[PDB]
Design an enzyme around this catalytic site. Sequence first.
Site: not given
Length: 223
Positions: A40, A84, A175, A177-178
């Site tokens: 995402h 994801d 922020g 994320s990942g």
Amino acid sequence: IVGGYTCGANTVPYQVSLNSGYHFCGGSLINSQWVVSAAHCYKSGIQVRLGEDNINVVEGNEQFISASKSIVHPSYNSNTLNNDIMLIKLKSAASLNSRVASISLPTSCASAGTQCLISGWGNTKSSGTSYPDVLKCLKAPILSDSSCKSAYPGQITSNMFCAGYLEGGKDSCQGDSGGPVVCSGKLQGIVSWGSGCAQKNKPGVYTKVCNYVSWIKQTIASN
Ligand SMILES: [Ca+2]
């Protein structure tokens, strides 16, 4: 990260910032040329920023390297956030040292109750908005599959796990994320999603990395 602590500069040496003119997502360095992040977080035009602490000041341990290619998981569903996960290849290999270092992939999945370290430059507020300039850290346990599914009925797949605190107050956030979830020196999760941040009975939901090790290794071997 809501309810965490200041990590300390270059204490999390596999943590990367993905930059497209501005920080927009985290990632994990898994070898000198490859980063894992959340699908995402996909966009074109990514620069990977390694060795960061303050993302707004050049402090002297940074390496900025453009991505040459991004590979979203072939089964990623952006509606459900199943699968994801994405891999990003660097145009040139990073110089690995004590402050810029890869994180190992799991040889086995983690269990509920394992304590893990979650990190990022995302929002530090559970309502409203404040973005830190320096890296934040949170220690949190993996929650049971049953508590995770009860928290988010109909939404948790076999490719997700929950970590954090059902009481609220401590969680990853926008922020982050990942970015990484590391447990006993292995990358077990990727910051994926949740309802708001740090809300009661709404823990963080993470991509279950151990399900993807075959795909990661094959993909790297041929790209
Ligand atoms: Ca910096």
